[PDB]
Amino acid sequence: VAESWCYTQIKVVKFSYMWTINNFSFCREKMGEVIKSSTFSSGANDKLKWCLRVNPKGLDEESKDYLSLYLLLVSCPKSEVRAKFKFSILNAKGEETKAMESQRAYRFVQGKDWGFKKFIRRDFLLDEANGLLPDDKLTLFCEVSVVQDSVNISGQNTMNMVKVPECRLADELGGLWENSRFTDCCLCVAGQEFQAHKAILAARSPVFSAMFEHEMEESKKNRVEINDVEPEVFKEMMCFIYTGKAPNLDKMADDLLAAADKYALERLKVMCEDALCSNLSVENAAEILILADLHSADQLKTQAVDFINYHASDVLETSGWKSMVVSHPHLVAEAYRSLASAQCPFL
Amino acid sequence: SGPVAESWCYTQIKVVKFSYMWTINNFSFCREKMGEVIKSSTFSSGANDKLKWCLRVNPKGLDEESKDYLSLYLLLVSCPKSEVRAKFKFSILNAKGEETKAMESQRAYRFVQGKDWGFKKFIRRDFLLDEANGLLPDDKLTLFCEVSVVQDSVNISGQNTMNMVKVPECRLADELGGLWENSRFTDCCLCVAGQEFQAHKAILAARSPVFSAMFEHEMEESKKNRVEINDVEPEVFKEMMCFIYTGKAPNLDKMADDLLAAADKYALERLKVMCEDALCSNLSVENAAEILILADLHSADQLKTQAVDFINYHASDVLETSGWKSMVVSHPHLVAEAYRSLASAQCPF
Amino acid sequence: VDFINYHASDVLETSGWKSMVVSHPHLVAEAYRSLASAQCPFLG
Amino acid sequence: NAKGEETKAMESQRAYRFVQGKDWGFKKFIRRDFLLDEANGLLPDDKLTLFCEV
């Protein structure tokens, strides 16, 4: 898992220095209050100025015991100079030990000298048994390292994968219907004249396949005559055939069920039955049952029979019921058989 | 049992969870002191830009109680003021990228801008400073946090059903397939290096712009029936035309190498992207060079970017492979792009 | 090579680099090797 | 019944009068940790599905 890394690497600058006096045993001469060192620098254009002054003799009370070593900031424009100095020895003979260091640093400022007053006692340092006077010389080493806080990273480390656009066949065929490119037949409906591609119609609608497949193209293909259906219902039907979707079906379920049953669109038939099924009011179940019987819509017929059985007490007062009994005895017999063997067999 | 049971009330609790890794090089070299502040980079979820979180740690915890314990918080940087809340966990990693130490806040703290709440006093410093503990590889501290803002406040009263009519699926791709394999009185004669295919004009023209430019222009007058495709092998042209009709290619990963070239030749954007997805999911160091040269050759973009990312990560071993040497001999500018990507991925050094 | 790696974000802009991209590929390959194998990892 | 559980839930042994603005039920069903215990099959996808019959 990964969403954003910010390394913000703390800026670390490091550099070295050395200090050799060839006559340490006799380097006192002037009683050793302080040795003014020659400055040194490094880094960006020698912008940081540094010098190491030593008070080898006893300027203070306890300084007779312990030898001295200090770091002095000769100059720097920025007041805050915080540096982690590591005073030590570059092993003239074999000695890498004996070099303590101060982890804590201090805010060095222009002209200020902050260091430590306590390095090592005089007597055994002067002694040759410890090997601290190689050829009457001694080497020092401060790893003066300065840091500052202006560092950040943004980072994303995004764990991304290639995205496939969703299927566009329905859109790329609807846009073919609305544009009418490379058409091959002209559907005729009630003054309006549509123009459509023979292959997709015959594929989705078997009744369309039947009247093209039988080798009457120039008779039928060029001027196939659909004389029953009206403009907007037929337009919706073609939109279903081409795109597989019926947008404004809910307000036209009746006549579109008729049209869909004509051409055996056995899914648009069920969509029309779904629109009609959740519309059954108490006073229209006669008409909807007449529909479902006439156009062989089985599921709507079953649901309308159940609705009439469950609203019999209300439906029989409606004039539509009287009309349907007048015209369709066998529908009344079917509803009767439906509530004969169910939704009543307790008495 | 009584299944179904009418409604489907399905109240949700939207949980946005995202991760954040915090890593300082040479952590215990200086890292300041006393109270101070190492304010981190503000970070969001990634989805949209409205919530802004950030870590904030002090190697020397503020106040004396947090002297031996590092003081860690988590502050709301900025957001459209709604008093957002979150439950959060802070976890420490190592070089091998496995969780070493992890603490999770028990409850979702309520947050507003300027108000912070976190694992104060989260761990004793001495445990971390233990070099034998192994939690400071290369002197570099690493930290990892997961913020789990939750708002809830979403309910739906199910769907009451109350109807039983079975509209069966959608079948458009299925019978359009029936127009191809059964071939159902097609219109234009295609030919692929000897084979004989019979396909339509309208579906090809709609779903493949190169075909539409091909078919609309001057073959309608003379040679609309016969057009020869002498560029792609028929055993993959069949899957091209089984995408153009039914909008899917089942046996694609067997031959996704050349199908990318075919799809990009005829500007089948969706199939080109599917081929990129099939090539992207089988990358390997032995052939990342070939995939990069391909994804440049056939103008692929996402596969080019992902092959670039893979080669940046696994540059260690690809150079020993012959694919890289062929790539450098043949395609210098690809090496220039990969080198540029690696350079930007390591800008601050 | 070490210099151009350290100044890469500006060196890639220069005309000399854009001439060396064509006139000398293996130099860019070796610069890539020194950037990849002789440095890294950097998070990822 | 995601996994097999048609048991473990109590039943109302007596019919209580329900009035406008009032609530009724019970409160002593199952322990919270036991509920959150996946061994009992009571955290499908960190979701709780209910089968109430009124």
**DSSP string for residues in A242-298:** HHS--TTGGG-HHHHHHHHHHTT-TTHHHHHHHHHHTT--TTTHHHHHHHHHHTT-H
Within 10 angstroms of residue A74's Cβ, the number of other Cβ atoms is: 15
Separation of alpha carbons B137 and A104, rounded Å: 23
Separation of alpha carbons A121 and A160, rounded Å: 65
Separation of alpha carbons A179 and A171, rounded Å: 12
Answer whether B5 touches D (CB < 8 Å): yes
Separation of alpha carbons A157 and A145, rounded Å: 32
Within 10 angstroms of residue B65's Cβ, the number of other Cβ atoms is: 11
Closest Cα to residue B2, out of A265, A112, D1? D1
Token pair of B125, please? 């410093």
Chains D, C in contact: 3+ Cβ pairs under 8 A?
no
Fold category of A15-146 in CATH? 2.60.210
> Helices in B157-254 by DSSP H: which ranges?
172-178, 202-207, 209-216, 234-246
Q: B82 φ, ψ to 5°?
A: -140, 10
Q: Are B234 and B193 in contact (CB under 8 A)?
A: yes
Closest Cα to residue B172, out of A300, A135, A204, A7? A204
| Chain B residues closer than 8 Å to A243 by CB | 172
Answer whether D20 touches B (CB < 8 Å): no
The sign of the dihedral angle between the CA atoms of A63, A64, A69, A70 is: positive
Q: Are B103 and B89 in contact (CB under 8 A)?
A: yes
Q: How far is C25 from chain A (nearest CA, A)?
A: 30
Q: How many residues does chain D have?
A: 54
Q: B101 φ, ψ to 5°?
A: -130, 140
- Cα separations (Å) of A35 from A55, A63, A72, B80? 7, 15, 12, 64
Q: Are B85 and B141 in contact (CB under 8 A)?
A: no
Q: How many residues does chain A have?
A: 347
CATH assignment, B171-277: 3.30.710.10
Within 10 angstroms of residue A234's Cβ, the number of other Cβ atoms is: 21
Beta pairing partners, B92? B101, B143
Residues in contact with B86: Cβ distance below 8 Å, sequence separation at least 6, in sequence order: B53, B108, B109, B111, B147, B148, B149, B150
Separation of alpha carbons B38 and B27, rounded Å: 11
Separation of alpha carbons B60 and B69, rounded Å: 8
> Could you say which DSSP state residue A136 is in?
G
Which helix (H) or strand (E) is B188 found in, with range? strand B188-191
Q: Are B136 and A132 in contact (CB under 8 A)?
A: no
Closest Cα to residue B306, out of B342, B323, B332, B281? B281
**DSSP string for residues in D20-35:** TT----------HHHH
Nearest chain D alpha carbon to B5: D51
Separation of alpha carbons B318 and B346, rounded Å: 19
Token pair of B157, please? 């009263």
Closest Cα to residue D52, out of D3, D11, D13, D8? D11
B/C interface, count of CB pairs below 8 Å: 54
Mode of pairing for the β-strands spanning B18-24 and A5-6 = parallel
Nearest chain A alpha carbon to C44: A157
Fold category of B18-149 in CATH? 2.60.210
How many contiguous H segments (helices) and E segments (strands) does chain B have?
12, 10
Q: How far is C44 from chain B (nearest CA, A)?
A: 7
User: Which residue type occupies B49?
Assistant: D
- Cα separations (Å) of C10 from A305, C6, C7, C28, C33? 82, 9, 6, 15, 19
Token pair of D43, please? 């955290």
- Exposed e or buried b per residue across A139-159, where buried means at least 16 C-beta atoms within 10 angstroms of its C-beta: ebebebbbbebeeeeebeeee
The sign of the dihedral angle between the CA atoms of B154, D45, B147, B123 is: positive
Q: Are C39 and A3 in contact (CB under 8 A)?
A: no
Token pair of A35, please? 């040795």
The sign of the dihedral angle between the CA atoms of B62, B66, B67, B71 is: negative
Separation of alpha carbons A309 and B52, rounded Å: 62
Beta pairing partners, A43? none
Chains C, A in contact: 3+ Cβ pairs under 8 A?
yes
Q: Are A275 and A249 in contact (CB under 8 A)?
A: yes
Interface of B with A in 280-299 (CB under 8 A): 280
Residues in contact with B70: Cβ distance below 8 Å, sequence separation at least 6, in sequence order: B57, B58, B59, B61, B122, B123, B125, B128
CA dihedral B183, B185, B188, B190 (to 10 degrees): 30
Beta pairing partners, B166? none
Token pair of B37, please? 């502040």
Q: Are A256 and A233 in contact (CB under 8 A)?
A: yes
Residues in contact with B205: Cβ distance below 8 Å, sequence separation at least 6, in sequence order: A176, A181, A182, B211, B212, B215, B216
Q: Are B76 and B52 in contact (CB under 8 A)?
A: yes
Taking the CA atoms of chain C, what radius of gyration do you get in angstroms?
A: 11
Q: Which residues of C touch A (CB under 8 A)?
A: 43-44
Q: Which CATH number fits domain A168-275: 3.60.15.10, 3.30.710.10, 3.40.50.720, 3.40.605.10?
A: 3.30.710.10
Q: How far is C44 from chain A (nearest CA, A)?
A: 7
**DSSP string for residues in C3-41:** HHHHTHHHHTTSHHHHHHHHH-HHHHHHHHHHHHTSS--
Q: Are B331 and B312 in contact (CB under 8 A)?
A: no
Widest pairwise Cα distance in chain C: 34
Separation of alpha carbons B17 and D44, rounded Å: 20
Mode of pairing for the β-strands spanning B18-24 and B141-149 = antiparallel
Within 10 angstroms of residue D48's Cβ, the number of other Cβ atoms is: 10
Separation of alpha carbons B276 and B260, rounded Å: 7
Token pair of B266, please? 């005829």
**Is there a cis peptide before residue C41, judged by omega within 30 degrees of 0?**
yes
Choose, out of D3, D5, D32, D51, the residue to mutate when testing the contact with B (most B CBs < 10 Å). D51
CB contact under 8 A, B346 and C26: no
CB contact under 8 A, B340 and C36: no
Residues in contact with A307: Cβ distance below 8 Å, sequence separation at least 6, in sequence order: A280, A285
